[PDB]
């Protein structure tokens, strides 16, 4: 909802609570970079010139945005570390300064693991940030969490995409929601009719 | 000759049975198709062909006993299948 409401940036009077209109801009770009997917990020906050004009005075944030958009992951983490440290020592964002990181990382992975279907891991050794076993353990701990669906093999050091399909899933949620409603109607018939 | 379950066959079999070298056989079968006496398709990457229909031919007074044999126990299958649905749904309308 925060990124849904900060779309204005064109009627934000020079309000007192955000003394700097620039702070308002930085906040709205921060939330928008996480709430929404590639189609709109490519349509609205990148093809609108008021924000672009503002960013023109803000090298850091502009670089941080373009890094993600143009897939130069080498500098993406360079920027994300700095934005993280800026996140920690700020009010109304510090309580979960960690959470943000744990999100963006995962999202960046889903950025790249979609184009390929059999990417080798050594490719991320140099192209994404150094350290092989580092990528190893982050991928391992992220996969089990039910997100970033794929599958790795250490013997030949390879990754398989493991695409799911629009029918098994579109069948599973059907069956579970049906069971839930059916339980509901059973109980609700039970209390009535003695 | 071959039973309808298969009617699929490899280059080598024809090549020997008609004693013509293998590299000719393609053109042979293409000729067969083009004159319109047999229908199907060819699957050259593994050297196989499939032949789904063939010109009828006359046959003798003992071969037709095979026809009568097949047809009889095909026929009984229909009556068997009718008994079931005429029975189990008796109450909807007999």
């Amino acid at each position: 909802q925060a990124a849904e409401l900060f779309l204005d940036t064109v009627s934000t009077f020079t309000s007192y609570e955000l003394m700097d209109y620039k702070t308002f801009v930085t906040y709205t770009v921060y939330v928008s970079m996480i709430a929404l997917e590639r189609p709109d990020l490519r349509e609205k906050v990148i093809k609108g010139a008021e924000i672009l004009e503002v960013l023109h005075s803000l090298p850091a944030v502009r670089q941080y945005l373009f890094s993600l958009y143009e897939c130069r992951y080498s500098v993406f983490f360079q920027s994300l570390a700095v934005v993280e440290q800026e996140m920690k020592k700020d009010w109304l964002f510090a309580p979960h300064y960690r959470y943000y990181v744990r999100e963006m990382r995962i999202h960046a992975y889903s950025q790249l693991l979609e184009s390929y279907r059999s990417l080798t891991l050594g490719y991320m050794a140099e192209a994404f940030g150094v350290g092989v076993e580092f990528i190893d353990q982050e991928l391992s701990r992220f996969i089990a969490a039910g997100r970033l669906h794929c599958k790795i093999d250490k013997v030949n050091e390879i990754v398989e995409t493991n695409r799911p399909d629009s029918k098994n899933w579109q069948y599973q949620e059907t069956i579970k929601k049906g069971d839930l409603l059916l339980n509901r109607v059973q109980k609700l018939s039970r209390v009535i009719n003695m | 000759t071959r039973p309808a379950n298969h009617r699929q066959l490899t280059f080598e079999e024809i090549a020997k049975s008609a004693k013509i070298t293998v590299n000719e056989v393609e053109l042979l079968v293409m000729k067969a198709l083009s004159v319109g006496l047999v229908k199907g398709s060819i699957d050259e990457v593994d050297k196989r062909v499939h032949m789904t229909w063939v010109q009828p031919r006359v046959l003798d007074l003992q071969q037709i006993k095979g026809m009568k044999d097949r047809l009889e126990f095909w026929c009984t299958d229909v009556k068997s299948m009718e008994m079931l649905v005429e029975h189990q749904a008796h109450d909807i309308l007999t």
Binding site: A144, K151, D153, V155, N156 | -
Partner: protein
């Protein structure tokens, strides 16, 4: 028989309950159980409704108050009569059979039946046995190789009571025996007071089982020169054995190439093409028409 309809329709049904409670309140239970057996027997002949529900629950109750055999009765019991129930008694009957199933080393199918038990309780404020059934459900699901659910731990009605269980699972997930001992030696009095200490006294082995299960779900093709290395297991010979047992009872689907030294797991997909969804749907069709 003459007024059996009314006499046993109620009044008697609740009477048995209260009369039993008295005895439990400040007395023994034994000749009560003999009387209950006799009274169940005189039912099931003239009548077959609610005389076979309240008595069954009470009788199994007092059997479980002690720690007897407790199973040879269910098999021939004929089950709590369906077709009629107050849907309330079904709940505790399921809870009882769930417990007596869990203590006899039958884990996998205990969770489903006791969850079915829980979903039948009302919306009422009482958290008397909801706390109990939740507590048992958490502890059986720490067996196998799962995670209980990171919810049903914060809800206002129940939180103080589940505190030690959260503090336990917070240890079990990381899988560090140190902290697990530091929890047990700290709250053992509480646990044995709960009447569920023995279940959790065997938990360490299922700890290692949960670790290897998550590993199985992570990778597909992996050498044994790492399974034990990253599980702190020093020997790679017994890793073969623990993995093989995990395969035997169905924890993971992989096979082992003993000479080669790699473990690979097979992938089976396309469940839509099989006949089973038709079955799952036919059952529900039948139920809806029944309603």
């Amino acid at each position: 028989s003459t007024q059996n309809r009314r006499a046993l329709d109620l009044v008697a049904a609740k009477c048995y309950y209260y009369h039993a409670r008295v005895y439990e309140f400040l007395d023994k239970l034994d000749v009560v159980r003999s009387f209950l057996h006799a009274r169940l027997r005189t039912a099931t002949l003239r009548h077959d409704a609610d005389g076979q529900a309240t008595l069954l629950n009470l009788l199994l109750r007092n059997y479980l108050h002690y720690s007897l055999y407790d199973q040879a009765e269910k098999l021939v019991s004929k089950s709590v009569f369906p077709e009629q129930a107050n849907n309330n008694e079904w709940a505790r009957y399921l809870y009882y059979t769930g417990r007596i199933k869990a203590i006899q080393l039958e884990y996998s199918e205990a969770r489903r039946t006791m969850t079915n038990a829980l979903r039948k309780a009302p919306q009422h404020t009482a958290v008397g046995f909801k706390q109990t059934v939740h507590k048992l459900l958490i502890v059986v699901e720490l067996l196998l190789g799962e995670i209980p659910d990171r919810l049903q731990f914060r809800q206002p009605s129940l939180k103080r009571s589940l505190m030690p269980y959260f503090l336990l699972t917070q240890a079990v997930r990381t899988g560090n025996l140190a902290k697990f001992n530091q929890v047990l030696d700290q709250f053992g009095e509480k646990f044995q007071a709960d009447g569920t200490y023995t279940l959790i006294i065997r938990l360490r082995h299922n700890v290692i089982k949960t670790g290897v299960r998550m590993i199985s779900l992570s990778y597909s093709r992996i050498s044994l020169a790492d399974i034990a290395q990253k599980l702190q297991l020093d020997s790679p010979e017994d890793a073969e054995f623990i993995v093989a047992k995990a395969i035997r009872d169905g924890v993971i689907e992989a096979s082992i190439n003993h000479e080669k030294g790699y473990v690979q797991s097979k992938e089976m997909i396309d469940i839509y093409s099989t006949r089973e969804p038709q079955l799952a749907f036919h059952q529900r069709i039948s139920f809806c028409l029944d309603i």
